[PDB]
Amino acid sequence: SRAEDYEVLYTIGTGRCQKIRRKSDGKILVWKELDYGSMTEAEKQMLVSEVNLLRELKHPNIVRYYDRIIDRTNTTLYIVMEYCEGGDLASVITKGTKERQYLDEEFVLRVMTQLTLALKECHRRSDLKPANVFLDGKQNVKLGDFTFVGTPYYMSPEQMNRMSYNEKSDIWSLGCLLYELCALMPPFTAFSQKELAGKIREGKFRRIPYRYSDELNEIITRMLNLKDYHRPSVEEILENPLILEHHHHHH
Ligand SMILES: COc1cc(-c2cnc(N)c(-c3ccc(C(=O)O)cc3)n2)cc(OC)c1OC
Numbered sequence: 180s181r182a183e184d185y186e187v188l189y190t191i192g193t194g195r196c197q198k199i200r201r202k203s204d205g206k207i208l209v210w211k212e213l214d215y216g217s218m219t220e221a222e223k224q225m226l227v228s229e230v231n232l233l234r235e236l237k238h239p240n241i242v243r244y245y246d247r248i249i250d251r252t253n254t255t256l257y258i259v260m261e262y263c264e265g266g267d268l269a270s271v272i273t274k275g276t277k278e279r280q281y282l283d284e285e286f287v288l289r290v291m292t293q294l295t296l297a298l299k300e301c302h303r304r305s306d307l308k309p310a311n312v313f314l315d316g317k318q319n320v321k322l323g324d325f326t327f328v329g330t331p332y333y334m335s336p337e338q339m340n341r342m343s344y345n346e347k348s349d350i351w352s353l354g355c356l357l358y359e360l361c362a363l364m365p366p367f368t369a370f371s372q373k374e375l376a377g378k379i380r381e382g383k384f385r386r387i388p389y390r391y392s393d394e395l396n397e398i399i400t401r402m403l404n405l406k407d408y409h410r411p412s413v414e415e416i417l418e419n420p421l422i423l424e425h426h427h428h429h430h
């Protein structure tokens with residue numbers, strides 16, 4: 180479809196993401212705008228293929244990407260996707276830090292269950308961090324968004340030695356994300372990357388807060404094992420007695 184099919188309501192975050200309304204039925208959506216005006220033919224060809232793959236991902240726990248619009252006037256590409264009224268997990272963690280208020284174990288179990296399912300789908304088809312995890316209005320958790328200055332808090336031991344495909348590296352990142360949801364801080368912190376790497380290598384961290392059960396602590400701790408082969412698989416995580424039907428997605 181074309182941009183005129185939609186009305187911009189307002190900007191959510193600055194490419195730039197905006198909440199929009201589809202005129203045909205008034206459906207509330209979001210689009211992300213990419214300015215391809217400075218791109219080469221080679222970069223546009225890569226872009227096209229990536230957007231195409233994006234359109235093929237249909238999963239309850241992956242942000243749904245509906246359409247792509249070209250506006251040759253502004254040299255802008257619009258990627259239309261579902262609206263997640265709950266925002267991102269980064270804002271939830273920030274909210275708790277400042278409220279001196281930990282999140283319910285039930286919420287952490289929802290995020291664990293639903294993100295593990297998202298990872299399972301990604302692995303089948305073959306950037307896990309709080310700002311890339313979105314919440315809808317029905318308690319559902321969705322993975323979205325498929326270089327310097329930033330601190331690589333979630334970088335796994337093996338990935339810091341040599342960046343290569345390893346599904347157990349994703350489990351480490353999930354571990355880090357769940358840890359942060361509980362403790363409201365990442366398991367490893369430092370002011371420099373050299374110091375960070377030394378800590379990650381040592382593999383030691385504080386227990387998550389005592390309000391969280393030993394069982395939750397145990398599985399998060401297993402995900403943060405220094406040995407990739409000691410971390411639980413997606414299958415092993417979902418077998419955990421903590422995970423129940425109600426922690427999964429519901430339309
Ligand atoms: C980054 O902060 C926020 C993001 C959103 C939001 C809602 N729906 C969405 N589909 C998205 C979203 C935006 C971009 C991407 C992506 O680049 O793939 C994936 C998801 N963000 C909503 C927000 O509040 C309504 C919000 O503020 C906390």
Ligand SMILES: [Cl-]
Pocket residue numbers: 275276279280281363
């Ligand atoms: Cl606190």
Ligand SMILES: [Cl-]
Pocket residue numbers: 271282286
């Ligand atoms: Cl919450």
Ligand SMILES: [Cl-]
Pocket residue numbers: 239240319428429430
């Ligand atoms: Cl759903």
